[model samples]
Target: SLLISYESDFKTTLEQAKASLAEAPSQPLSQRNTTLKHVEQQQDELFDLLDQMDVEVNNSIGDASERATYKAKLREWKKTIQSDIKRPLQSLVDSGD
Candidate 1:
């Protein structure tokens, strides 16, 4: 661990998916449906992350006045990701109907 890699790998991947889907509306309907895989997979990754992470958080944070604060922001971030992806999915359905 001399080079010292950390969680930024996860950080970078999350945004890349978010932005791709955020712009999914400008693309074709079927294409957006294709893109839905990213959303679903990301949702699962994040779900497992939160569940698995709690124990890590317990150790990593002797402090969660801050940890508690993180959950708020983290939950809200998930909400927006879930919410925004819905729009792309909705557009797909609307186009087909």
Candidate 2:
């Protein structure tokens, strides 16, 4: 439950972050950095939540089919967010100005 909520929030925040950055590419570096920092923090939280979810689901979801479906959905979300965040963050960090 916690993990699900965390992921949902992370997804919302990420979309907002992307929209903000895209809409205001000319924003001052400091302001942009602050937004990026929030996104990074949220990303880290999501990763930690995913780890906890893995353990909880494994232990609690006993049935094989249920576990497989849950695992597949988890993996899909993990990949989707990781890919979504990768380029913007890298560009922000490597911008060096």
Candidate 3:
């Protein structure tokens, strides 16, 4: 599904940014900016997917258990984005040039 694809893409982008940050001192500003841009784009895409999932859950005709499962997944996704992407990106920004 689109959600899964976006999650995978976000993870891959996050990893790239982490690797880039590890070498940040030597990396050119352009290179670091490129990596950060990709990270930001992927983060936005993941957020959009989560919003879509929320709408789907709200409009679901399925049983309560199914909706609950989706809610749990949404929670996990939010946690992952916050921990894996948001925090790291903020730290990167705060590190300065």
Candidate 4:
């Protein structure tokens, strides 16, 4: 059920999330708070979309064999993304922009 056509859109969403965080204004506390909230919402949305892809990947990976190589690749992708990217973002976000 996974469509490869959505990959580019997903990547664009991720880039937008990063750009929104990077563009947060430094002057006003209220503006910073609003941007941070938007960033958090986008982060949650990104994960939700990513999870949908993972489900599709899982369903596609298994066939008659039930070996699920595609699902395993998805897991590896999750691990790499979390460790290399998301964890750092969490710390940065926690520091308040």
Backbone clash count, each prediction separately? 1, 0, 0, 0
lDDT of 2 at 39: 70
lDDT per residue (tens digit) for residues 1-97 in model 2? 6656755775776677566546435677778778777777766766776787788788778999999998998898788667776566676578746
Q: What does candidate 1's lDDT look like per residue over 1-97, in tens digits?
A: 2111223434465676668767766667677767767766765665555545555555666775988975676577567556655555556557745
Per-model TM against the reference: 0.57, 0.72, 0.69, 0.64
Better of 1 and 3 by TM-score: 3
Among these predicted structures, which one has the highest lDDT? Answer: 2
Task: Point out where model 1 deviates above 4 Å.
Answer: 1-10, 26-30, 86-97
Q: Report the C-alpha displacement of residue 7, candidate 2, in angstroms.
A: 4.9
What's the CA error at residue 48 for candidate 2, in Å? 1.4
lDDT of 3 by residue, 1-97 (tens): 6545645665675566556545654667788787677767777776776787687666753788878887898899778878877887788788564
- By TM-score: ranked, best first: 2, 3, 4, 1
The TM-score that candidate 3 achieves is: 0.69
lDDT of 4 by residue, 1-97 (tens): 2536445555676677667666664537778668768777766666676687776665565574553655565567556447544764576667654
The alpha-carbon lDDT assigned to residue 81 of candidate 3 equals: 76
Evaluate residue 67 in candidate 4 and report its C-alpha lDDT on the 0 to 100 scale: 38
Highest-scoring model, TM-score: 2
Residue runs of model 4 more than 4 Å from their true location after superposition: 25-27, 62-73, 76-89
Better structure of 2 and 3 per lDDT: 2
* Quality of model 3 by C-alpha lDDT: 0.71
